[PDB]
Ligand binder design. Sequence first.
Ligand SMILES: Nc1ncnc2c1ncn2[C@@H]1O[C@H](COP(=O)(O)OP(=O)(O)OP(=O)(O)O)[C@@H](O)[C@H]1O
Ligand SMILES: [Mg+2]
Length: 837
Amino acid sequence: NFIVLDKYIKAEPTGDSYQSESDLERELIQDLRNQGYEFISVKSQSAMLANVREQLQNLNGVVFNDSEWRRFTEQYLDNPSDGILDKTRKIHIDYICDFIFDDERLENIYLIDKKNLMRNKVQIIQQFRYDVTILVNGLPLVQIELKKRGVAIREAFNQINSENSLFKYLQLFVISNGTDTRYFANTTKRDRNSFDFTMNWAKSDNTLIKDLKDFTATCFQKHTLLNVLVNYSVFDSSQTLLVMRPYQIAATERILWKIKSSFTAKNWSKPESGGYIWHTTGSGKTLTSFKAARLATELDFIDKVFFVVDRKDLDYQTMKEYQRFSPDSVNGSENTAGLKRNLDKDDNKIIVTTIQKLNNLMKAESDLPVYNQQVVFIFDECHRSQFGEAQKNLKKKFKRYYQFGFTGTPIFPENALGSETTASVFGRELHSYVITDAIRDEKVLKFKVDYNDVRPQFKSLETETDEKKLSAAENQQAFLHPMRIQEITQYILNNFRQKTHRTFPGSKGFNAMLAVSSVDAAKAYYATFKRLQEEAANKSATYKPLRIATIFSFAGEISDETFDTSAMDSSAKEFLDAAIREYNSHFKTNFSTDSNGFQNYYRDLAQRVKNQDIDLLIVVGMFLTGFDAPTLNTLFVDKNLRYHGLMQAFSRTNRIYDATKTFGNIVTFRDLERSTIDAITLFGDKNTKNVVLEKSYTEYMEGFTDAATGEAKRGFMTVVSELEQRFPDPTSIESEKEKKDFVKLFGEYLRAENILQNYDEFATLKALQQIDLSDPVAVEKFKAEHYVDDEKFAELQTIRLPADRKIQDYRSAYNDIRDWQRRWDDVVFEVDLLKSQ
Ligand SMILES: Nc1ncnc2c1ncn2[C@@H]1O[C@H](COP(=O)(O)OP(=O)(O)OP(=O)(O)O)[C@@H](O)[C@H]1O
Ligand SMILES: [Mg+2]
């Protein structure tokens, strides 16, 4: 009985007017009542408290007196000092209070029955703003915000903890205009707080369920809702609440059903017992897989659950997270001691480990009791090389097992390259969520891939398709040639802030990575960066330097780098040591070259790249696979990437953040265009690249038509033209209609400008807006910096952009109309783009 349905029957309108908010609320209440949600009238905190007393007393089979209830309220349920985070902690972890009565007996008082869900009492109330609140055992856990049919859901979200304090217990938010319904977690954290994280409910085929009637009839089925709240909502060690998306739940629950059905049939340790999940890169594989293992421990018939990852994919939050379930057993090292120690932990089913360690252990160990136990394996995006050996030993040793795997880049026959196919190893595909689905849902970002062809001397070298010549090409004469490195480094320095959206004043923006071909490349780059930055530091006292850092150790798959720095040669070792010394100096930290020091350097670095304490990370093969950095928008690539490695590296930029991050920038100094198309194609079909790859500069300036949606889009020059024709201003106002039309138009302007900030052509056009009128030192400087010859420099002067001041006036008027709107249904303001500018 899956809560993400294989088949659902699109319901019928009554009807029975569906236009207004109270109409939506009427049908919502009626439908929920048909679904077994008792409706009650609660006008106060007092009445809520009373109702809760009733439900909890019934649920726990106990009766408080007024003194005991008051004490229970003040010290556990209703603590005045409690915030939202404390209530979430109470729902997810601390949901049992061991209470001392007046007669001095001790009893466990549950807020929720998680063992038997349906014993829980669900109820509904309405607003005491049109809202409908779902109470579980009296506690409000769900909030449905209702808006009129006309109201744009993104603006509705844009609009909408203290008192009444019981509403701190809120876990799940849902907001509907009746055409569309979107759910999102309740939290105080602000980094997941944008519209991009709101979610549509769906089926196993990931077909969306937009409207309120069907959302209600599916997501709001008591069994579905309660399972989403209790079993499908992850609370991490940073006290962040993440509600899972339908594809994550579908995959997870299908894995659970698979394990159980395979156990009932006593059919195990063969491909048909387990399964694989194809979840496109960035879709949340680590979150879901770890969650699945944790749920798999809840099966009584299972003795042990292995959750296994690749040390290559480790980073700060993830290690912090694994530490509590498997103390000091998860790291870069080869040591199996922590693994075999956790393996002996009494009354404990979960073991997190790295594939390296599991393989080492399975190599060294023979008679381990676990081999004979009923075991579940969950593999999270493991590289092929280690995985094969691990599989050989796994097959030979564990006698009763169900193994599962998550990947965003499966192994088909056509990419086999010496290894076994994913299907051969894991058997059936239990669920799929592909790249095109993810991009359709906006849960993942597109790529803008561009070869920067600025360098004629090195061009034929950068276009080389032959594998052997490329290997031979790494030296000071060809790829590592001082001028090439200097030109690239100068480009990256010059265009960094532009790429990363640091350009407009006071803007926070993003950061970037530089992926390179080898250790010598990394060294050359770091050195050149320091040199050029010191020179620019001389040239100007107003220069504001970037913070560069690097990490690497020793070696279309991306080559793994061990955490043992001893394997490095002396030159690299000394350069890394020097780099860590400098890093230590600036950041006031102590990390050393030794195993532990380098391990903690890796950790601290991951952390500082995630929060933008470091502006550009110069890496070779590290952090190119699993690294999670939503604020990283740009990857610079001097390296040969193909297929799964290509997709995995590029995906470092694919994390959604908000309206500011439109897509990830991939700026390459070697021609990757063909490899990009091949890679995207392998993992999709011949049309996949059109959905994945962003369109051209010319298309965004002059207009085009999107294939997937079918909609026509302006047309930034068209937008600007309409701004000047229709709104010379202030007289182009004052009526309401003109205000509205202007808000819509300028909205388009802001979205288009924001998009075009990532194109060198537009950056150049904008750049040209200071320049000349007498001394052409800055003219030739403009030509050299933007690599623009005279033939272009002539035409760029012909293209009229609107004056900076006119833009400022537009922006301030836009903001004014917004503030006024606070004190119009179709209209959506760009809050996110505004708040930066
Ligand atoms: N259901 C969700 N709700 C909120 N945030 C989510 C959800 N699922 C994933 N995320 C966020 O998306 C980001 C990427 O998650 P994650 O690294 O698990 O994806 P992945 O597919 O494992 O990535 P990769 O393919 O690089 O290994 C994380 O920061 C995570 O917090
Ligand atoms: Mg991951």
